[PDB]
Amino acid sequence: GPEMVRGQVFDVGPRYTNLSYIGEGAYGMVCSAYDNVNKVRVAIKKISPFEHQTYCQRTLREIKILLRFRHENIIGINDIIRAPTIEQMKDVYIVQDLMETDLYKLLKTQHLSNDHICYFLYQILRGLKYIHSANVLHRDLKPSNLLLNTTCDLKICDFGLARVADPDHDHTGFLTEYVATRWYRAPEIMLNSKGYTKSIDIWSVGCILAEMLSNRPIFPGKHYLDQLNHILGILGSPSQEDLNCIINLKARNYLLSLPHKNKVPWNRLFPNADSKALDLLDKMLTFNPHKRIEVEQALAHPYLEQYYDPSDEPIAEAPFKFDMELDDLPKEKLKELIFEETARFQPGY
Ligand SMILES: Nc1ncnc2c1ncn2[C@@H]1O[C@H](COP(=O)(O)OP(=O)(O)NP(=O)(O)O)[C@@H](O)[C@H]1O
Ligand SMILES: [Mg+2]
């Protein structure tokens, strides 16, 4: 029999055994396991995306991007399992290195030292520099998508929302709405919902940094439209300069309609925090996408000066172009392309 975990079958045997629940999502489960061939612990991410076109499109991106990345702060695909024939393929199992925990879990039991906070943030942006260098948006950075080891090694995971945006095309109007986990959404996801850029990742990192500072989501929006309130609750009302830059009239007017809100100094929310950390937190959580700090300048910031070394922060040698964005296709065609992507992992080939 294939091992079961909480009544979800995990058809990965006989190579991978002793499964333990580690996490789940809308359309998949993750287990700790033992690689009987390499005599190592692993993590296996069961993905069951074939019923919907969105899940298929995201699954194909997550595999294609992760397969072409190699970076110390980005989880690798060791192995992919699926059925030997497409009709029989109903799930896809993505075997990765087992990390010990994630930031979400770590933050429930630990107040992190300034040194840890600093070093984790350093690693997040080291990764994010590779990701952005490659013309990828991650689009779901949050504590639970950051893995950790007792050595304090960090890895970005869950490229389930990630995507290529070739900088040689204007993606305004073509990007998916409603991306990221709600508390980590940049304001322009709400106001320029198809017109955002990779700066939405730098916003997510601000929220993660805040969360590392206070063990608490800074912007805990109770629902989609409450999220924009919690943001302005701290940042104050946008400047007149910041409103004019919102091209969407519908969204500009809604903001103009809202009551005036005052800025909460970072000092007041993080009274025991490093001032340098609050400075970077300020540049990462800037309302204007265009004035918000970029990944390179973030690393260069004084807070991360013990770790910054552009000689030891790799970038992608072949950044991804429009060709890797041709996924606006029926679920049956995307399943075929997922079959083709995962074939190099099969007895055969
Ligand atoms: N390689 C790994 N090592 C250790 N834990 C892992 C690993 N991969 C995933 N996890 C854990 O599994 C959880 C869910 O995995 P993830 O890849 O984020 O799933 P998801 O199905 O996309 N869910 P969601 O982030 O809500 O979209 C993570 O938040 C971690 O707690
Ligand atoms: Mg996901």
Tab-separated table of C-alpha atoms and ligand atoms in Angstrom:
chain	number	residue	atom	x	y	z
A	1	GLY	CA	0.000	0.000	0.000
A	2	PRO	CA	1.124	3.659	-0.565
A	3	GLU	CA	1.723	5.370	2.855
A	4	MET	CA	-1.138	7.724	3.932
A	5	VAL	CA	-0.788	10.982	5.982
A	6	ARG	CA	-4.029	12.465	7.392
A	7	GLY	CA	-5.976	10.357	4.807
A	8	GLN	CA	-4.020	11.921	1.879
A	9	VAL	CA	-2.181	9.082	-0.020
A	10	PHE	CA	1.559	9.797	-0.772
A	11	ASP	CA	2.563	7.471	-3.685
A	12	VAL	CA	6.395	8.106	-3.412
A	13	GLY	CA	7.486	4.621	-2.137
A	14	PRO	CA	9.540	2.530	-2.160
A	15	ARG	CA	12.481	5.108	-2.353
A	16	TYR	CA	10.901	7.697	0.083
A	17	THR	CA	9.388	6.429	3.446
A	18	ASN	CA	8.516	7.386	7.098
A	19	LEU	CA	6.225	10.341	6.072
A	20	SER	CA	5.334	13.085	8.612
A	21	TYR	CA	2.892	16.037	8.080
A	22	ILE	CA	4.912	19.306	7.876
A	23	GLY	CA	2.285	21.581	6.201
A	24	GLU	CA	-0.425	21.945	3.486
A	25	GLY	CA	-2.128	24.506	1.162
A	26	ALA	CA	-5.340	24.975	-0.923
A	27	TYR	CA	-4.331	22.135	-3.320
A	28	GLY	CA	-1.373	20.176	-1.796
A	29	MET	CA	0.304	18.590	1.304
A	30	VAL	CA	3.982	18.573	2.446
A	31	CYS	CA	5.664	15.710	4.449
A	32	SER	CA	9.096	15.073	6.005
A	33	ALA	CA	10.423	11.745	4.636
A	34	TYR	CA	13.543	9.478	4.386
A	35	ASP	CA	15.381	8.943	1.023
A	36	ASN	CA	16.352	5.232	1.346
A	37	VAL	CA	18.587	5.681	-1.777
A	38	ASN	CA	20.636	8.774	-0.632
A	39	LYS	CA	20.263	7.996	3.177
A	40	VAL	CA	19.008	11.581	3.805
A	41	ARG	CA	15.924	13.315	5.212
A	42	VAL	CA	13.798	15.142	2.594
A	43	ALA	CA	10.519	17.112	2.281
A	44	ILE	CA	7.931	16.024	-0.332
A	45	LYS	CA	5.311	18.536	-1.614
A	46	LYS	CA	2.261	16.672	-3.053
A	47	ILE	CA	0.509	18.968	-5.623
A	48	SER	CA	-2.995	18.032	-6.912
A	49	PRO	CA	-3.660	20.807	-9.403
A	50	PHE	CA	-5.190	19.073	-12.460
A	51	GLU	CA	-8.909	19.897	-11.810
A	52	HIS	CA	-8.322	23.731	-12.204
A	53	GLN	CA	-6.504	25.864	-14.871
A	54	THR	CA	-5.060	28.270	-12.185
A	55	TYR	CA	-3.470	25.420	-10.134
A	56	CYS	CA	-2.080	23.857	-13.388
A	57	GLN	CA	-0.595	27.275	-14.493
A	58	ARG	CA	0.990	27.881	-11.031
A	59	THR	CA	2.260	24.271	-10.735
A	60	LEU	CA	4.003	24.578	-14.169
A	61	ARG	CA	5.658	27.940	-13.195
A	62	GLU	CA	6.716	26.643	-9.693
A	63	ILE	CA	8.433	23.604	-11.349
A	64	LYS	CA	9.949	25.483	-14.370
A	65	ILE	CA	11.302	28.381	-12.206
A	66	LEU	CA	12.575	26.138	-9.312
A	67	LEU	CA	14.212	23.694	-11.818
A	68	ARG	CA	16.213	26.582	-13.428
A	69	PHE	CA	17.262	28.254	-10.113
A	70	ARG	CA	20.460	27.351	-8.111
A	71	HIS	CA	21.037	29.636	-5.025
A	72	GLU	CA	21.939	28.960	-1.344
A	73	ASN	CA	18.756	30.893	-0.221
A	74	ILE	CA	16.325	29.213	-2.676
A	75	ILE	CA	15.035	25.670	-1.983
A	76	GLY	CA	15.995	23.228	-4.781
A	77	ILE	CA	13.963	20.436	-6.456
A	78	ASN	CA	16.029	17.237	-5.787
A	79	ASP	CA	13.432	14.973	-7.486
A	80	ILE	CA	9.901	14.956	-8.997
A	81	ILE	CA	7.590	11.901	-8.835
A	82	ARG	CA	4.520	11.317	-11.029
A	83	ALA	CA	2.759	8.441	-12.879
A	84	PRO	CA	4.547	7.008	-15.970
A	85	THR	CA	1.475	7.978	-18.220
A	86	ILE	CA	-0.409	11.362	-18.332
A	87	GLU	CA	-3.954	9.772	-17.950
A	88	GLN	CA	-2.646	8.061	-14.766
A	89	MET	CA	-0.897	11.301	-13.439
A	90	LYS	CA	-3.340	12.851	-10.840
A	91	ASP	CA	-0.677	14.320	-8.410
A	92	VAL	CA	2.963	15.593	-8.656
A	93	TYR	CA	5.479	15.136	-5.756
A	94	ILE	CA	8.306	17.678	-5.462
A	95	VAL	CA	11.167	16.231	-3.349
A	96	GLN	CA	13.332	18.996	-1.719
A	97	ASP	CA	15.950	19.210	1.088
A	98	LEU	CA	14.240	18.946	4.525
A	99	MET	CA	14.751	22.252	6.463
A	100	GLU	CA	14.067	22.163	10.266
A	101	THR	CA	11.357	24.847	10.530
A	102	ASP	CA	10.041	28.085	8.890
A	103	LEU	CA	9.991	31.707	10.256
A	104	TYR	CA	6.218	31.555	11.077
A	105	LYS	CA	6.780	28.483	13.379
A	106	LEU	CA	10.075	29.982	14.779
A	107	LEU	CA	8.303	33.294	15.728
A	108	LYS	CA	5.687	31.430	17.889
A	109	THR	CA	8.429	30.283	20.415
A	110	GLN	CA	11.405	32.710	19.955
A	111	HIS	CA	12.110	36.416	20.408
A	112	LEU	CA	14.965	36.730	17.799
A	113	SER	CA	18.179	38.635	18.700
A	114	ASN	CA	18.896	41.763	16.550
A	115	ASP	CA	21.765	39.666	15.079
A	116	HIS	CA	19.403	36.844	13.925
A	117	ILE	CA	16.782	39.346	12.587
A	118	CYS	CA	19.556	41.148	10.638
A	119	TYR	CA	21.152	37.894	9.289
A	120	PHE	CA	17.721	36.385	8.257
A	121	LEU	CA	16.771	39.681	6.481
A	122	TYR	CA	20.260	39.628	4.820
A	123	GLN	CA	19.549	36.082	3.476
A	124	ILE	CA	15.926	36.955	2.357
A	125	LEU	CA	17.235	39.812	0.169
A	126	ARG	CA	20.291	37.750	-0.988
A	127	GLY	CA	17.750	35.255	-2.411
A	128	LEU	CA	15.387	38.007	-3.636
A	129	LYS	CA	18.320	39.604	-5.582
A	130	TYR	CA	18.807	36.276	-7.469
A	131	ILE	CA	14.999	35.989	-8.003
A	132	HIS	CA	14.659	39.583	-9.318
A	133	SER	CA	17.946	39.280	-11.358
A	134	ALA	CA	16.091	36.445	-13.212
A	135	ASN	CA	13.001	38.635	-14.093
A	136	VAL	CA	10.884	36.524	-11.600
A	137	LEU	CA	8.336	37.928	-9.156
A	138	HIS	CA	7.941	35.571	-6.097
A	139	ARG	CA	4.640	37.333	-5.157
A	140	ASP	CA	4.029	35.352	-1.900
A	141	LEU	CA	6.970	36.177	0.472
A	142	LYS	CA	5.803	35.675	4.125
A	143	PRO	CA	7.355	34.027	7.231
A	144	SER	CA	5.790	30.593	6.385
A	145	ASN	CA	7.529	30.626	2.889
A	146	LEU	CA	10.990	31.102	4.557
A	147	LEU	CA	12.780	27.932	5.766
A	148	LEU	CA	15.435	27.843	8.537
A	149	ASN	CA	18.035	25.445	10.023
A	150	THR	CA	19.733	25.476	13.501
A	151	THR	CA	22.814	26.778	11.525
A	152	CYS	CA	20.583	29.845	10.721
A	153	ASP	CA	20.709	28.955	6.975
A	154	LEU	CA	17.589	30.465	5.301
A	155	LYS	CA	15.769	29.493	2.067
A	156	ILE	CA	12.829	31.066	0.230
A	157	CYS	CA	10.217	28.379	-0.754
A	158	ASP	CA	6.641	28.247	-2.262
A	159	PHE	CA	7.202	29.530	-5.832
A	160	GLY	CA	3.491	28.547	-6.226
A	161	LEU	CA	2.574	32.238	-7.077
A	162	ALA	CA	5.892	33.136	-8.783
A	163	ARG	CA	6.041	34.222	-12.442
A	164	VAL	CA	8.263	35.705	-15.176
A	165	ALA	CA	7.798	39.366	-16.260
A	166	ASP	CA	10.322	40.055	-19.059
A	167	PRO	CA	11.359	43.721	-18.538
A	168	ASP	CA	11.282	44.134	-22.417
A	169	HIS	CA	7.384	44.118	-22.270
A	170	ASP	CA	4.903	46.436	-20.420
A	171	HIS	CA	2.962	43.986	-18.134
A	172	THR	CA	0.542	46.787	-17.077
A	173	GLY	CA	-2.962	45.263	-17.346
A	174	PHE	CA	-1.703	41.635	-17.791
A	175	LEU	CA	-0.711	40.623	-14.183
A	176	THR	CA	-2.908	38.488	-11.951
A	177	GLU	CA	-4.990	40.312	-9.372
A	178	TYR	CA	-5.266	39.224	-5.766
A	179	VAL	CA	-1.720	37.888	-5.375
A	180	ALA	CA	0.362	37.407	-2.160
A	181	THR	CA	-0.988	36.425	1.348
A	182	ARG	CA	-3.299	39.275	2.526
A	183	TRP	CA	-1.129	40.798	5.384
A	184	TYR	CA	1.929	40.947	2.988
A	185	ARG	CA	0.170	42.682	-0.023
A	186	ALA	CA	1.685	45.985	-1.251
A	187	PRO	CA	-0.979	48.760	-1.459
A	188	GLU	CA	-0.703	48.884	-5.323
A	189	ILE	CA	-1.915	45.217	-5.445
A	190	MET	CA	-5.212	46.740	-4.153
A	191	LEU	CA	-5.026	49.992	-6.250
A	192	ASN	CA	-3.079	48.938	-9.450
A	193	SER	CA	-4.336	45.316	-9.276
A	194	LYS	CA	-3.027	44.234	-12.768
A	195	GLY	CA	-0.222	46.854	-13.041
A	196	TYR	CA	2.101	46.034	-10.069
A	197	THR	CA	5.874	45.246	-10.320
A	198	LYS	CA	8.530	43.197	-8.411
A	199	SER	CA	8.629	45.984	-5.746
A	200	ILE	CA	5.574	44.100	-4.266
A	201	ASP	CA	8.237	41.578	-3.041
A	202	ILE	CA	10.224	44.363	-1.283
A	203	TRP	CA	6.947	45.321	0.484
A	204	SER	CA	6.444	41.703	1.642
A	205	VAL	CA	10.034	41.773	3.065
A	206	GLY	CA	9.165	44.952	5.029
A	207	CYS	CA	6.162	43.100	6.581
A	208	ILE	CA	8.435	40.076	7.337
A	209	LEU	CA	11.065	42.425	8.946
A	210	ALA	CA	8.324	44.129	11.037
A	211	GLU	CA	7.009	40.653	12.015
A	212	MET	CA	10.601	39.593	13.039
A	213	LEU	CA	10.820	42.854	15.158
A	214	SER	CA	7.555	42.410	17.200
A	215	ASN	CA	6.538	38.667	16.692
A	216	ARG	CA	3.283	40.063	15.096
A	217	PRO	CA	1.946	40.799	11.601
A	218	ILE	CA	2.157	44.658	11.379
A	219	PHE	CA	-0.881	44.812	8.975
A	220	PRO	CA	-3.387	42.107	10.162
A	221	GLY	CA	-6.267	42.985	7.733
A	222	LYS	CA	-9.463	41.035	8.711
A	223	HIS	CA	-10.452	40.896	4.932
A	224	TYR	CA	-9.308	42.142	1.441
A	225	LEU	CA	-10.468	45.837	1.748
A	226	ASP	CA	-9.665	46.169	5.533
A	227	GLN	CA	-5.980	45.509	4.417
A	228	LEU	CA	-5.595	48.997	2.782
A	229	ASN	CA	-6.962	50.584	6.075
A	230	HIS	CA	-4.395	48.808	8.412
A	231	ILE	CA	-1.641	50.067	6.022
A	232	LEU	CA	-2.708	53.762	6.021
A	233	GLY	CA	-3.480	53.313	9.777
A	234	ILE	CA	0.387	53.271	10.235
A	235	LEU	CA	1.777	55.020	7.047
A	236	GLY	CA	-0.798	57.868	7.220
A	237	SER	CA	-2.799	59.206	4.215
A	238	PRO	CA	-0.755	59.166	0.964
A	239	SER	CA	0.922	62.538	0.025
A	240	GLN	CA	-0.661	64.554	-2.870
A	241	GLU	CA	2.457	63.508	-4.897
A	242	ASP	CA	1.645	59.795	-4.096
A	243	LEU	CA	-2.033	60.120	-5.197
A	244	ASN	CA	-1.209	61.734	-8.626
A	245	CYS	CA	1.019	58.645	-9.387
A	246	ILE	CA	-1.949	56.213	-9.074
A	247	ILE	CA	-2.951	56.135	-12.819
A	248	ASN	CA	-6.207	54.229	-12.101
A	249	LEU	CA	-8.804	57.042	-11.528
A	250	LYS	CA	-11.297	54.615	-9.864
A	251	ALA	CA	-8.641	53.778	-7.201
A	252	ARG	CA	-7.295	57.409	-6.822
A	253	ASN	CA	-10.911	58.636	-6.108
A	254	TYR	CA	-11.544	55.888	-3.464
A	255	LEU	CA	-8.362	57.055	-1.633
A	256	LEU	CA	-9.323	60.814	-1.939
A	257	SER	CA	-12.728	59.697	-0.430
A	258	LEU	CA	-11.090	58.022	2.712
A	259	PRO	CA	-10.712	60.088	5.952
A	260	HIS	CA	-7.245	61.688	6.596
A	261	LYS	CA	-5.039	59.317	8.711
A	262	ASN	CA	-1.770	60.398	10.507
A	263	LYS	CA	1.629	58.626	10.264
A	264	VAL	CA	2.613	56.394	13.248
A	265	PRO	CA	6.386	56.890	13.799
A	266	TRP	CA	8.242	53.515	13.567
A	267	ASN	CA	9.733	54.320	17.071
A	268	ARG	CA	6.199	54.078	18.583
A	269	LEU	CA	5.599	50.509	17.141
A	270	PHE	CA	9.231	49.262	17.580
A	271	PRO	CA	10.489	51.196	20.635
A	272	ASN	CA	13.285	48.614	21.439
A	273	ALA	CA	14.298	48.119	17.708
A	274	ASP	CA	17.653	49.152	16.058
A	275	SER	CA	17.179	52.605	14.349
A	276	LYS	CA	18.955	51.294	11.199
A	277	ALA	CA	16.382	48.439	11.060
A	278	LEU	CA	13.489	50.959	11.316
A	279	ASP	CA	15.191	53.093	8.563
A	280	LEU	CA	15.217	50.071	6.122
A	281	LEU	CA	11.703	49.063	7.289
A	282	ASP	CA	10.736	52.672	6.279
A	283	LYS	CA	12.273	52.419	2.718
A	284	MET	CA	10.799	48.873	2.176
A	285	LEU	CA	7.284	49.963	3.437
A	286	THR	CA	7.085	53.115	1.170
A	287	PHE	CA	3.533	53.698	-0.269
A	288	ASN	CA	4.891	54.725	-3.713
A	289	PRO	CA	6.061	51.635	-5.648
A	290	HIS	CA	8.615	53.822	-7.555
A	291	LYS	CA	10.197	55.545	-4.462
A	292	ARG	CA	10.309	52.148	-2.551
A	293	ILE	CA	13.866	50.730	-2.143
A	294	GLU	CA	15.082	48.007	-4.615
A	295	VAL	CA	16.740	44.720	-3.579
A	296	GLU	CA	20.340	45.892	-4.420
A	297	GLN	CA	20.055	49.225	-2.497
A	298	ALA	CA	18.350	47.327	0.450
A	299	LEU	CA	21.486	45.063	0.797
A	300	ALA	CA	23.746	48.166	0.555
A	301	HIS	CA	21.664	49.740	3.456
A	302	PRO	CA	23.714	50.273	6.690
A	303	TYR	CA	21.663	47.682	8.742
A	304	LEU	CA	23.102	44.795	6.604
A	305	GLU	CA	26.678	46.220	6.316
A	306	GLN	CA	28.300	43.207	8.141
A	307	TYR	CA	26.881	40.810	5.440
A	308	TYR	CA	26.744	42.890	2.167
A	309	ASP	CA	29.404	41.706	-0.334
A	310	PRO	CA	28.433	41.916	-4.052
A	311	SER	CA	31.378	39.516	-4.773
A	312	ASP	CA	29.414	36.704	-2.912
A	313	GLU	CA	25.751	37.428	-4.002
A	314	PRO	CA	25.186	35.523	-7.292
A	315	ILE	CA	22.661	36.618	-9.980
A	316	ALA	CA	20.981	34.506	-12.684
A	317	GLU	CA	23.346	33.970	-15.709
A	318	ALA	CA	20.339	33.356	-18.047
A	319	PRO	CA	17.429	35.581	-16.880
A	320	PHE	CA	14.011	34.300	-18.130
A	321	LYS	CA	12.261	35.920	-21.175
A	322	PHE	CA	8.602	36.004	-22.513
A	323	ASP	CA	9.074	32.375	-23.854
A	324	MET	CA	8.752	31.119	-20.201
A	325	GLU	CA	5.362	33.043	-19.808
A	326	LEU	CA	3.358	31.107	-22.496
A	327	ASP	CA	0.925	29.402	-20.010
A	328	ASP	CA	-2.448	31.158	-20.874
A	329	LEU	CA	-3.701	27.730	-22.150
A	330	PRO	CA	-6.344	25.081	-21.310
A	331	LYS	CA	-5.686	22.837	-18.227
A	332	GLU	CA	-5.249	19.749	-20.551
A	333	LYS	CA	-2.401	21.451	-22.485
A	334	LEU	CA	-0.791	22.696	-19.152
A	335	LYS	CA	-0.985	19.085	-17.784
A	336	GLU	CA	0.868	17.979	-21.002
A	337	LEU	CA	3.577	20.649	-20.420
A	338	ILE	CA	3.845	19.579	-16.693
A	339	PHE	CA	4.263	15.952	-17.912
A	340	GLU	CA	7.048	17.196	-20.331
A	341	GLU	CA	8.745	19.351	-17.596
A	342	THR	CA	8.933	16.447	-15.010
A	343	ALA	CA	10.053	13.751	-17.561
A	344	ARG	CA	13.813	14.209	-16.979
A	345	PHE	CA	13.152	12.631	-13.498
A	346	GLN	CA	11.792	9.314	-14.973
A	347	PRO	CA	13.362	5.881	-15.559
A	348	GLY	CA	13.494	6.360	-19.414
A	349	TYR	CA	14.351	9.658	-21.197
B	1	LIG	N1	11.736	21.878	2.083
B	1	LIG	C1	11.034	22.055	3.205
B	1	LIG	N2	11.609	21.826	4.414
B	1	LIG	C2	10.886	22.034	5.517
B	1	LIG	N3	9.627	22.431	5.629
B	1	LIG	C3	9.093	22.673	4.423
B	1	LIG	C4	9.715	22.511	3.204
B	1	LIG	N4	8.871	22.870	2.166
B	1	LIG	C5	7.764	23.254	2.768
B	1	LIG	N5	7.839	23.162	4.144
B	1	LIG	C6	6.773	23.505	5.095
B	1	LIG	O1	5.553	23.285	4.413
B	1	LIG	C7	4.710	24.465	4.511
B	1	LIG	C8	3.839	24.541	3.287
B	1	LIG	O2	4.707	24.377	2.147
B	1	LIG	P1	4.516	25.340	0.886
B	1	LIG	O3	5.520	24.948	-0.172
B	1	LIG	O4	4.496	26.774	1.309
B	1	LIG	O5	2.978	24.980	0.543
B	1	LIG	P2	1.652	25.584	-0.178
B	1	LIG	O6	0.849	24.331	-0.427
B	1	LIG	O7	2.091	26.418	-1.362
B	1	LIG	N6	0.820	26.491	0.946
B	1	LIG	P3	0.688	28.127	0.976
B	1	LIG	O8	2.019	28.822	1.212
B	1	LIG	O9	-0.388	28.497	1.973
B	1	LIG	O10	0.445	28.647	-0.403
B	1	LIG	C9	5.722	25.601	4.670
B	1	LIG	O11	5.089	26.811	5.083
B	1	LIG	C10	6.721	24.942	5.632
B	1	LIG	O12	6.223	25.036	6.951
B	2	MG	MG	1.563	28.446	-2.553
